[PDB]
Amino acid sequence: FTLIELMIVVAIIGILAAIAIPNFIKFQARSKQSEAKTNLKALYTAQKSFFS
Amino acid sequence: FTLIELMIVVAIIGILAAIAIPNFIKFQARSKQSEAKTNLKALYTAQKSFFS
DSSP states (O other): OHHHHHHHHHHHHHHHTTTOOOOOOHHHHHHHHHHHHHHHHHHHHHHHHHHH | OHHHHHHHHHHHHHHTTOOOOOOOOHHHHHTTHHHHHHHHHHHHHHHHHHHH
């Protein structure tokens, strides 16, 4: 190999350092949203029992 | 050939000994700068995971 190859290797690791991977904060927010579901269903259940 | 040719041969060797070529220390420095990119991206990743 020659100089151009080594410079391309450096450029490629520079590229990978700035890769645009998926926004996983969306996935973690979706995980966090489960509190609302569980607690609202608990509201529903408690309201039904109180009415009964 | 004659004396002038042989002296020109010696002179051409002298010229090649003092040739001005590209400054490759800059290429070495550009190679060394890739650590900063890698480690800063590691900072970014670790901060994101800690926040999550």
